[PDB]
Symmetry: C3
Subunit: 376 residues, 3 copies
């Protein structure tokens, strides 16, 4: 490809510095003997170390598209470019033009290249995933719609990288965005639109419709939940492990005995747009295959669940928008607020400094853990 | 031991390369002078760095037994073996057989050994705990019995190492496996065994025994909980901090005033097989010692709690079984499912790829945060 | 400053070893030519790598004051001190006093210094944030007042560093210490003070005041919650996005229509000492600015929330006290208990070993996932 070709070039630069003096002036080399080969072996082993490490932490596809440029990867690529181009400049101007003797020195130059390129690899790991290991900041991430709030420690990251960690943890941790669960508030607001301290006072003196409606809805949800549990238990008890059929046909055989209760529960919890019949049968054959209980099958459907339980078209990984007052390549600090906007909701994230903590020993003597039967 | 002896050998290989030319041919060395000693000091300091780092990240007992071989540790041991054996081969064939001059070069060979062995240490850290720092995959871990589900980001790990991280997080995070809490479903299923769309329809039209039984059981659990809270509060108020007695005798003195309520609560929550009287007295003296409140004592007993709250024979760390369709030394990828089976339950873990995320700036002007008093 | 001056000294030590032979004996140098410059370039690039890495992971303010000395940072500073002082000792005794020839060797000495100082940087990262990456221990952290309990995996850390990670996670994860929520128990205990197995038996036979009082308080809290939700929904619907006013004046305009319900809810949940009117208006203008819903505004006020949601004087980062039976510089092990005492509560933390886990393959054939329609 493109980056792999440049990786091959930067990997073959030491070998190119080594092989050319024997090719271009074979008779002109001074006899190295033992030191040159004892150096070649260290060169080869360090290049193998470099290849294994570069495979381990850089032979991978890009993780995300970021709004501005990645500062640290651009810094590393510029460093590698000036590094390799300067070494070629010195090897062409001061080695190839002069057709130098004492080839052992050329071998030290190549091994210095290998050492410094290993330290470039080490600096790359330092900049990319070792700089944010120490949890310097805390990020409160709140959805703008239902207000689900979670905190996360991060290190010294830019707003871009912190936002991407926030999104990783969003798809992991936050429950999936359900706009249906948001409709009631909207209608209530609109109903107040259909119809300042004293006016609020009269609202308190009025009938709290919301309390009793929420209690009745909770009662209905628990009723549908118990119906669903009984239905799924009977439906799993209708098949024995041991006509012989695969778990797909077993799921299709036992599904009509749970389908109506599950439909009613997903409509009473407004989750019917998140579980297609095909997906329910897929997860059902999954649970039948892996020997799970009715409750283990059903816990996907009881609670809302995070975004990664659901289908791939359900999460819109492509349309996230980072809204920051400052440049998003700037690092995190205390008090900054950035907002990760999706199509209908937004992750309002405010960053606070984890405070400076002072500890001090006080010595509690195990002789001081005496106790008496008297009252206190 | 065995591995420590090989560690001593790999640590003394440079010192063995250094000390032998003065021993085996003392008069034949060319005078080094300043450079050789200025090299010895760098050698010694780098070997001290190597010793400190190897102690810091490798002087520790094995963490877990894995089904197949650890790929990366075997790769590192093979690398060290070929590394050291090749250096001995070169030192024996091309240095000892020829009884070489210019001892400074022998010192560079030894320092190249030290440098490359430091980079082997660095590659070992790269392969072992720096390769999975970047959270590449997400793992949904569901118990097969009660369906408790948690997500975890992992990096590029094999199925073995990912499964072991899943087990670490299982003993940390998931509530402890309580088969008693599973009995009711079983009996209900068996009761349906004692006695297809229309037949389910008639189930919906029937009396939902489960809803009212769950509500009544919840009521009973809350009643027992309040009894237990009052009991433990009175029992802690029966002793003053200040006959003088240790917290063990204080726990034994105040336990009979909480014992019956705690027994009834642990039987109504089916937790009586997880708290022995000796363990309750131990935790009670622990709470009396550390000045905890009745609620701080009681929160261990109110909720189910994870597996590591309990006794050591309670968690069966030895009998875990990794069930994967492919080889467990293969790395994680999107869509693979592996199952960690214990004696009665199983952690069904499916691995998904954290999706490719695209961010883009949109600029919200603080001039655009204007607002009016009119309704919307 | 002080540490920056020593950093400048340790950064200029190689440059000081290089520049002095041309200054102090200019005519006495043997001609180096190509090797010396091809070495200088590697020196400069490795020093640039060192500068970037030292900026990335050490140019930062101190994170916390610890009771005893930090063992690893003191070890690293002692290592750097003996390192640099020994190199100056060799450069003064064996190089400057003798006014040596073969300047290439001086350049190798300086580059060995740069290499070993890069490995000191690497050892510093190994000791500081790579030693605890592997989750060796689990820490149960329980507050002594309300008993909120969370587990955390840590690596090989000292009691000091583990306690500071526990405090980072305390301000992140645990709900904020509310002594008002603790008053009821105290009064109940005192009431029992105002007035042993049979006496507890009679307590069970008595009226459970706590159950019905908790149920009635829960009912009141839900009532106030629904009042508050309706109030905040109407108050947000009173302003349109589009007299033109900033979100501060919008918050002040819509606040009197939610103020009484919010005051009643914060008094019924005993959160009135944690939200000042100024803070409520600040968060209100924050929610109006970022386009959040009434529920997104209100979720800060509904639940208790962790400590970092609140004001900076609310968390007393300065007065934490580490109580350990052993030395706090000792590393974690199985069974140790340390207590982090604040002004009124204490984080009782007990450390357990994550158990030794044995895995083994068992092969479940996809041919063995057959199923039949018969009952089980």
């Amino acid at each position: 490809t493109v980056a792999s070709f440049l990786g091959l070039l930067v990997f073959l630069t030491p070998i190119a510095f080594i092989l050319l003096p024997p090719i271009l002036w074979r008779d002109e080399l001074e006899p190295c003997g033992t030191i040159c080969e004892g150096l070649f072996i260290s060169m080869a082993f360090k290049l193998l170390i470099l290849l294994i490490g570069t495979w381990a932490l850089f032979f991978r596809k890009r993780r995300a598209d970021m709004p501005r440029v990645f500062v640290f990867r651009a810094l590393l690529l510029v460093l590698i470019f000036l590094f390799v181009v300067s070494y070629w400049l010195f090897y062409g101007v001061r080695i190839l033009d002069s057709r130098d003797r004492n080839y052992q020195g050329i071998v030290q130059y190549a091994v210095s290249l290998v050492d410094a390129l290993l330290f470039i690899h080490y600096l790359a790991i330092v900049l990319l995933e070792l700089r944010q290991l120490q949890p310097m900041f805390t990020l409160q991430v709140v959805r703008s719609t239902d207000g689900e709030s979670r905190f996360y420690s991060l290190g010294h990251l830019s707003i871009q990288r912190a936002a991407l960690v926030v999104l990783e943890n969003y798809y992991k941790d936050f429950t999936i965005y359900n706009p249906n669960l948001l409709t009631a508030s909207k209608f209530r607001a609109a109903k107040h639109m259909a119809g300042i301290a004293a006016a609020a006072r009269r609202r308190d003196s009025s009938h709290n419709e919301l309390y009793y409606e929420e209690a009745e809805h909770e009662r209905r949800v628990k009723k549908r939940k118990a119906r669903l549990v009984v239905a799924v238990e009977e439906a799993f008890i209708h098949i024995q492990r041991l006509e012989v059929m695969d778990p797909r046909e077993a799921a299709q055989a036992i599904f009509p005995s749970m389908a109506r209760a599950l439909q009613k529960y997903l409509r009473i919890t407004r989750q019917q747009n998140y579980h297609s019949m095909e997906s329910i049968l897929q997860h059902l054959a999954f649970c039948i295959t892996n020997g799970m209980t009715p409750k283990a099958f059903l816990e996907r459907y009881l609670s809302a669940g995070p975004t990664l339980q659901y289908d791939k078209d359900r999460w819109l990984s492509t349309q996230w928008r980072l809204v920051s007052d400052e440049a998003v390549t700037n690092g995190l600090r205390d008090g900054i607020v950035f907002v990760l906007k999706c199509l209908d909701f937004s992750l309002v994230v405010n960053v606070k400094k984890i405070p400076f903590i002072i500890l001090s020993e006080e010595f509690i003597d195990p002789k001081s853990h005496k106790f008496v039967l008297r009252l206190q």
